[PDB]
Amino acid sequence: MKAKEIIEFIETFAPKDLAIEGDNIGLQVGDNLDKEIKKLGIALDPSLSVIKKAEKEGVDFLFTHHPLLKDPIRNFTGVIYKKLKILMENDIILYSAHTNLDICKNGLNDALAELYNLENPKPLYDNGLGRVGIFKGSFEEFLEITKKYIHKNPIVVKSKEVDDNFKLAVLSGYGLSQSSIKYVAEKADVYLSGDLTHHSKILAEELGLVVVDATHYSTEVFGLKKFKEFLSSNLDLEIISLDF
């Protein structure tokens, strides 16, 4: 299996056009895409220890959810120097599917929507991040599903009492920004996502939106694990995970 053919496979599952404007998806680091791949590594972040571990584990193709850079740079020093040095010395390909993997069908957001068995699930935003639908059950049933499958100790901002058969909004990753709370508050009773901060918490309380922070990491890894299983089932390649 050549590198281009792995990319071709991923892009069929999660087309790059789906990614929201400005998102740095696609090839991050690499030159020869007809190179043969004997081992595939998958990770949430293209972090320094992830890349170090990929080098140690003999990874040929490194697939990450988050891009290497979101802001363009014009100097190569410090950390990015260290990262690139390892990738280039071993000719390791770095490729990312970011929001296109969040948004696509059977993607990270769909994965959560299926975990909570939402009824008539819809995209939360038009672009089309997140899912929203009815959760058929009690708040404590919802909360135990979360504790068992996502994160053992989610932070709960219990702004209000939640009735059975409530609308649950899910967004994998960083979805608890102030503008997001305001947006989702008009569309859901409970919001499951990650990366809660003070102003977002205060805002959720005022708007009566119940927010459950299951962390950025856990809400994405859940889906990423499913995607890993999908690659394993369809690709005749060694696949390992590096940070999950």
Partner interacting with residue 70 (select from a second copy, Fe ion, none; CB below 5-8 Å by kind): a second copy
User: What is the signed CA dihedral for 218, 219, 223, 229, rounded to 10 degrees?
Assistant: 10
Kindly calculate the radius of gyration of the chain based on its CA atoms and give it in whole angstroms.
19
What residues make contact with a second copy under the rule CB under 8 A?
Answer: 24, 26-31, 45, 47-49, 66-79, 81-82, 84-85, 88-89, 174, 194-195, 197-199, 202, 205-207, 215-217
Give the nearer residue to a second copy in terms of CB position, either 12 or 198.
198
**Least distance (Å) from Fe ion to the CB of residue 68?**
13
Nearer to Fe ion by C-beta: 30 or 173? Answer: 173
Query: Is 101 or 157 the residue whose CB approaches Fe ion more closely?
Result: 101
Choose the contact partner of 77 out of Fe ion, a second copy, none; CB within 5 to 8 A by kind.
Answer: a second copy
Asked whether 194 and 215 are in contact (CB, 8 A), the reply is yes
C-alpha distances in Å from residue 63, one per residue of 108, 233, 243? 15, 17, 12
**Smaller CB distance to a second copy: residue 77 or 120?**
77
Between residues 49 and 165, which has the closer beta carbon with respect to a second copy? Answer: 49
Distances (CA, A) of 102 to 66, 74, 113, 224, 238: 11, 29, 12, 10, 24
| Binding of Fe ion by 130 (CB under 5 A) | no
- Residues 138-197 interacting with Fe ion (rule: CB under 5 A): 173
Is 107 a residue that touches Fe ion (CB under 5 A)? no
Q: 26: alpha, beta or left, given left = phi > 0 and alpha = psi -120 to 50? A: left
In the complex, least distance from residue 154 CB atom to Fe ion, rounded to whole angstroms: 17
Distance CA 25, CA 45 (A): 13
- Partner interacting with residue 60 (select from Fe ion, a second copy, none; CB below 5-8 Å by kind): none
**CB-closest chain residue to Fe ion:** 173
The DSSP bridge partners found for residue 193 are 213
162: amino acid identity, one letter:
V
Residues at the site binding Fe ion, with contacts judged by CB under 5 A:
173
